Amino acid sequence: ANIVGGIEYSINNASLCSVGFSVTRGATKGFVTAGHCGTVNATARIGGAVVGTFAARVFPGNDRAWVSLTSAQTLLPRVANGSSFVTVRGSTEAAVGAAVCRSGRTTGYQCGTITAKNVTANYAEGAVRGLTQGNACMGRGDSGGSWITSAGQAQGVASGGNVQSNGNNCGIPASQRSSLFERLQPILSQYGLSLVTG
């Protein structure tokens, strides 16, 4: 499968999440995603084909994971934006007030601005600390997807937010949205990964 940020993948033929970013670990190909999407060794599938398995994850506390893929997958330095693509150029962290967009299988590509950092989400499973908050909307299924600036600087992977009864926070004003992501930097260093860029 061609690995692009934002596309859907399933875990153990049940749950769906979105791909965050293509990365490598030495000769190993992989993608970073949300830790709540799967447990170690859960199987990931893209378009019904097995592409790899969860190699590690942390959740709750943090919300991160990386899936190691088979040699046959094609890693691409890109994030989906409708039918088009945003090129990944690096991982400079943007500051509060910067504009940012996110990509995922449920709401597509949505943009907004970062409104706060070091936010704690109190999930049913336990707290997740140190998240960054943006006001781009998102829905159930967007988890693990890419958060990126239009300039191509990868920010992190979708964790959660205040989804309403319709499954997203797109029907409430930006001023009232809390959409959270896990910072990419600590995930790259924790697992020794390098981002694929173009």
């Binding site: 999930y123 049913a124 998102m138 964790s159 205040n162 989804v163």
Partner: peptide, 4 residues
């Protein structure tokens, strides 16, 4: 907030 909820995970996703």
């Amino acid at each position: 907030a909820a995970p996703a």
